[PDB]
Amino acid sequence: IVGGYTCGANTVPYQVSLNSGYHFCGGSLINSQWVVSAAHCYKSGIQVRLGEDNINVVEGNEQFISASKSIVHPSYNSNTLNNDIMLIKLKSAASLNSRVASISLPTSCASAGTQCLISGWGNTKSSGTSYPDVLKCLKAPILSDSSCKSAYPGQITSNMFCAGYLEGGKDSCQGDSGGPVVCSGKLQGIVSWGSGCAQKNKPGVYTKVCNYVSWIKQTIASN
Template sequence: MNFLCTRQGNISASLFLSLRFKSCLNSLICTVAFHVLTVSTSASVHMAFPLEDDDKIINGYECPRHSQPWQAFLTTNNKRWCGAALINEWWLVSAAHCYKPTLAVHLGEHNLSEVEGSEQHIKVAKAIKHPGYSPWTADNDFMLIKLQRPVQFNEYIQPIQLANSCAPAGSQCLVSGWGNLKISEVQYPDVLQCLQVPILSDATCRQAYKNQITSNMFCAGFMEGGRDSCQGDSGGPLVCDGVLQGVVSWGDECAKANAPGVYAKVCNYNAWVAEIIGKN
C-alpha cells in the first residue's frame, strides 16, 4: 500500500519520510527506488505521508473474470498508476494522492496483457481532489474524475453505488486491483486480484496508527499481517455488501503485522460528490 512513514516527537524529533518513486518501463514492468530522509522538527506530531505510488494485493486471488465491473485503473503517460471505481457513466472516484495533470481511465479490463475486446480507454477531462485533502496527513484522500466522454455500459462495465451509511466493524469486504503481488520485490500481475478483508474497529485502527487516523479513515485487513493491498492498488475500491465503502489510501508498508490497510471513508463524501457532479 502507499506508504510513508510517520513523524513523531516532542521537543526534538526526527522526521522519517520513506519515499518510493516508481518508474514503469511499460504496463507490466516497474521498478521502485527508495530514499529515506531524516530531518529535525520541533513539533510534536504524528503524520502519514502517502507515496506517489499505487497499491498491490498481497496473498489474494485472481478475481473471477469481470466480477468487479466498476474496477478501473489509471495510467499517466502510458504508465500504470492507480486504481479507481466507476460510479456513473461520466464519473469515477479514486484517491487524491493519485492525482496527475494527465490521466487516462481503463475500464472493462481483466488481463492487461491481452486484448480482450471488452476494454474502454477514455481520457480524463478533469480530476478534482477533495478541498480538505492534506498530503501531509492523508486526510480526505478522495478524488472525483470526470471522463471526456461517457462510458458505454455493458456486461463488462457497470457502476457501483456509493455507500449511504458507514459499514460497521466486522463487515466482510473485497478489495481489488492490479498492484504488486510481493512484499520484498516488484511483481505486478497481468490479471485483476481480489482479497477479502474485514473492517477493523476504530479502536484497533487507532492502536495501530496512533494519532494518524482521522474521522475520514478506517482500517481493513489482518492485524497478523500477510494479506493486504499495496503499490499499484491506491485509489481502488473496497466493496462491502455491493456498495463502495472505501478507497485504498495508505499503510505502513504492505502486509505488515499490526499495520492494516487504511482507506478513505466513502460514506463521508456523499454530499460533496453530489455537489461536484451537480456543478460539473
C-alpha cells in the same frame, strides 16, 4: 494485493485502471461519466481504462476514455493523507454492460466486522516486487476504530478506516492505490495508505467514502 486471489475477467466491473502510459492507480466507476480514486493518485494526462482484466493485453471488453477534469478534495492534505479522495470526469460516457458497471455510493457507513472486497493490480509481495497483469481480489473485514488507532497511533482521522488482518499476510499494496473497497454492493473505501504491505499489526488504511457522499453528489451535479 498481497495474499489475494485472481478475481476473474470482468468480475469487478466497476474497477478502473488509471493510465498515464502505464497503470499507476485504481479507481471506481460511480456513474457513466465519473470515477472516484485517491487524491494521492492525482496527475494530469490520465486515461481511464474500464473493462480491464489483463492490463497488458487487449482482450476485447476495454473502454479507454480520457479524463476531461480532475477534482481533488478541497481539504486533501498530502502529508497526513486526510481526505484522500478525488473525482475524475470522463470526456465521454462509458457504455455500461455486465462487464462495465457503476458501483453505488453508500447511504450508511459500514461497521467494524463487515466483510469487503478490495481489488487492484498492485504489488503482490510484502518484500520485493511482483506486479500482476490480471486483477487481484481480497476479502477483508473492516477493523474496529480502536484496533485501527492502536495500530497507527496519531495517524487515523474520522475520514479513515482500517481493513485487513492484524496477523499480516493479506493487504492492498502500492499500485492498488485509489481502488475500491466494496461492502454489501456499495463503495465504502478507497485504497489510501499503510505501513509497507501485509505487515503484522499494520493493516490497510482506506478513505471513508460514506463521509464524502454529499461532496460527491453536489460535485457531479455542477461539473
